[PDB]
Write a protein that binds this ligand. Structure first.
Ligand code: BR
Ligand code: BR
Ligand code: BR
Ligand code: BR
Ligand code: BR
Ligand code: BR
Ligand code: BR
Ligand code: BR
Ligand code: BR
Ligand code: ZN
Length: 258
């Protein structure tokens, strides 16, 4: 792989190595709130993170992933639009160089400063690598970030970033509680889509919360001190690691709320 978010390998190039980039169910999308249909058949989301076990944080050269122990049903997502049980494997964010961009999904064309993705795989497929080969393999919970008051539950993530500045670095990251990243309301929009990074597999049920979380300017500024490059290489700040909105095509976005 050579893709990225630089001047010559960014989203508009991905289709050359990953032709599904021009597929029928690509993500992210703009959420037209006027057009999304309230679906009284959608259930409340069940986010069950009481037993979550974080293990490690990794700079993978395109974001940082907070990884979980997904060897048992500890931290699982169910309900909502989903049939069955999805196990949390990792979360990560996408963010901008400035507060006016950074999210992947947009809401009536509004871009948020960042977007959190909590990635879960369907236990009926046994492992993540098998799940991504299935149209109902993953459930990603997406949460917008706006800049205002600090998010206290994010600070532990922020403070470890200095230790994983460059691509390939990891650090122990135990005992982190992802419930501290969840807004008050679980109202959501949902639609069928894809991973937003190569290989762009069309395996995701997206669940995008309506209510953003607030983080401070100082918190997001620290995300922007990360590097895409490896240690000692020319510094390239990890900023603008978002894919823009893709064509909705023959898809409906449904709302869980009136
Ligand atoms: Br694009
Ligand atoms: Br709305
Ligand atoms: Br509907
Ligand atoms: Br992912
Ligand atoms: Br993603
Ligand atoms: Br993959
Ligand atoms: Br709201
Ligand atoms: Br909040
Ligand atoms: Br820092
Ligand atoms: Zn993501």
């Amino acid at each position: 792989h050579h893709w990225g978010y630089g001047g010559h390998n960014g989203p508009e190039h991905w289709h050359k190595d990953f032709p599904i980039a021009k597929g029928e169910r690509q993500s992210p999308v703009d959420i037209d709130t006027h057009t999304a249909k309230y679906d009284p058949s959608l259930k409340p989301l069940s986010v069950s993170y009481d037993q979550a076990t974080s293990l490690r944080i990794l700079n993978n050269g395109h974001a940082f992933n907070v990884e979980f122990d997904d060897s048992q049903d500890k931290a699982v997502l169910k309900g909502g639009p989903l049939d069955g049980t999805y196990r949390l494997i990792q979360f990560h964010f996408h963010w901008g160089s400035l507060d006016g961009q950074g999210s992947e999904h947009t809401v009536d064309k509004k871009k948020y400063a960042a977007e959190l993705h909590l990635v879960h795989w369907n236990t009926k497929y046994g492992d993540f690598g098998k799940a991504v080969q299935q149209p109902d393999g993953l459930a990603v919970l997406g949460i917008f970030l706006k800049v205002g008051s600090a998010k206290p539950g994010l600070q532990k993530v922020v403070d470890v970033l200095d230790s994983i500045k460059t691509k390939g670095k990891s650090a122990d990251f135990t005992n982190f509680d992802p419930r501290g990243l969840l807004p008050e309301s679980l109202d959501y929009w949902t639609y069928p889509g894809s991973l937003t990074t190569p290989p762009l597999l069309e395996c995701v049920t997206w669940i995008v919360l309506k209510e953003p979380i607030s983080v401070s300017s100082e918190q997001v500024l620290k995300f922007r001190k990360l590097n895409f490059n490896g240690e000692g290489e020319p510094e390239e700040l990890m900023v603008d690691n978002w894919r823009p909105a893709q064509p909705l095509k023959n898809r409906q976005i449904k709302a869980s709320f009136k």
